[PDB]
Amino acid sequence: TKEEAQETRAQIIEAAERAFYKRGVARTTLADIAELAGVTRGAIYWHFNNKAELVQALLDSLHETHDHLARASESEDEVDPLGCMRKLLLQVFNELVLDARTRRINEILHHKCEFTDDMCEIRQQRQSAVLDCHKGITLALANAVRRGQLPGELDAERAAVAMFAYVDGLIRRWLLLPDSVDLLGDVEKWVDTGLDMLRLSPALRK
Amino acid sequence: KEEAQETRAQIIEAAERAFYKRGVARTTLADIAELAGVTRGAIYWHFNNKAELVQALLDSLHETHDHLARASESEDEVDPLGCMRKLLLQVFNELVLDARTRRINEILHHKCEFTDDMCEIRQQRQSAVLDCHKGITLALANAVRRGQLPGELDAERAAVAMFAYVDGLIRRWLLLPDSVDLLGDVEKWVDTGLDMLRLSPALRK
Ligand SMILES: CN(C)[C@@H]1C(O)=C(C(N)=O)C(=O)[C@@]2(O)C(O)=C3C(=O)c4c(O)cccc4[C@@](C)(O)[C@H]3C[C@@H]12
């Protein structure tokens, strides 16, 4: 409930993003995240025990902007879940293009963050999160089955992986070669292309 | 050879070992050299720097599929889409059965940072992806020229959609393998992809 410590936590997060982004997550110490932030070594430790905790705080911020539509899509009480899933994807893509903060954490996540046995928790955290995310899209896809928006004999599980794979590879393609996906201009196409596969692909049924 | 040609294959092997253990960012050539039992100078005779080693591991992934790739990319092929099916199935098989291929993909996706202290890695990957992208395009185009796919079909985007999907499937399997019976369901996983390209209006113009 104090405020200096809420200010200081929010500045460690900013510095970390800028640091991890220049030097990468591998060779960046917490001492480093200190000098850049203006703060003190001790303060980073009060706030974060280790760098894997910090990285986790970063990955976690990405789910905040989307919580609403995510929760709506998966509630069995939603009238239009495919509807919420389509708007979620439009928002994910839009936020990625407009918001430099999101583009950078994604860049840290995809191109600047090694899984080395020396730092085992980076990978575990990441596994957990993809399983989480996985959980969600499944409940959601199965809801669009009941309500007759997706084919009735769909395999939610596999369909979820298909879609996740598709969204993940596309975000990554765009971070590597933005000038090859007019992702802002065509966002509707890219999102719908993914959904297409889910509703029509015969190999996703059963 | 005189001074070994093989020394090369031995440096590449120690590079995979070091890279897989400590990652690309913090492996030095002295690490690689001690791992291979040679000196830094022996490394310098085959490679100018670390980005050259990474490059050579990356470029080693392409050999196996070589002929099925050219086959798809050739106009004179009777069955371009079937050649892409054969290729995807091999990509998935080799990845699941060959520890060497699994380890290098794992280096590439999860143990290789792009940082401006070396920008060559990011650049090498970029051209690598455009190269491959260009191949998919010409592949998708033939399948259209012979009515294996829908008509006048927007290739460029279906290409990107293809690569995105395969790429993210691989990465998904490297992260959580016991959640994609990749080996066992290879047929379904490949075709889900191919179904996208033929049955998706959004990929039509
Ligand atoms: C080791 N792994 C198996 C291969 C690889 O080294 C890749 C890489 N970027 O290093 C892939 O992206 C690789 O995983 C990959 O994504 C490949 C493809 O996407 C395709 C697609 O989609 C269609 C036709 C041909 C290919 C391909 C030959 O380029 C595939 C090569 C794949």
Spans of all domains in chain B: 1-205
Q: Is there an atom of ligand 1 within 6 Å of B121 CB?
A: no
Q: Which of B163, B171, B172 to mutate to test the pocket of ligand 1 (most atoms within 8 A of CB)?
A: B163
Window 54-113 of B: residues touching A by CB (8 A cutoff) are: 110-113
Ligand 1 atom showing the smallest separation from residue B61 Cα: 6
Confirm if A153 and A198 have CB atoms less than 8 A apart. Answer: no
**CB under 8 Å to B19, separation ≥6 — which residues?**
B27, B54, B57, B107, B111, B112
- b/e per residue, A108-137, with b = 16+ CB within 10 A? bbbbbbbbbeebeebbebbeebbeebbebb
- Which superfamily does CATH assign the domain made up of B1-205 to? Tetracycline Repressor, domain 2 (1.10.357.10)
Q: Please give the backbone phi and psi of residue B39, each rounded to the nearest 5 degrees, phi first.
A: -110, 170
Closest residue to atom 1 of ligand 1, CA basis:
B61
Ligand 1 atom showing the smallest separation from residue B104 Cα: 1
**Residue in this structure with the two tokens 């099925």, named with its chain if needed:** B68
User: Does B171 sit within 8 Å of A165, measured CB to CB?
Assistant: yes
> What CATH code would you report for A1-206?
1.10.357.10
Calculate the alpha carbon distances from A26 to A76, A115, A146, A195, B195 in Å. 42, 9, 46, 36, 39
Ligand 1 atom showing the smallest separation from residue B92 Cα: 3
User: Does A167 sit within 8 Å of B23, measured CB to CB?
Assistant: no
Q: Which two tokens stand for residue A21?
A: 């982004």
Which method was used? X-ray
Q: Is there an atom of ligand 1 within 6 Å of B170 CB?
A: yes
The distance from CA A18 to its chain's CA centroid, rounded to whole angstroms, is 18
Q: Is there an atom of ligand 1 within 6 Å of B108 CB?
A: yes
For chain B, the C-alpha Rg in angstroms (whole number) is 19
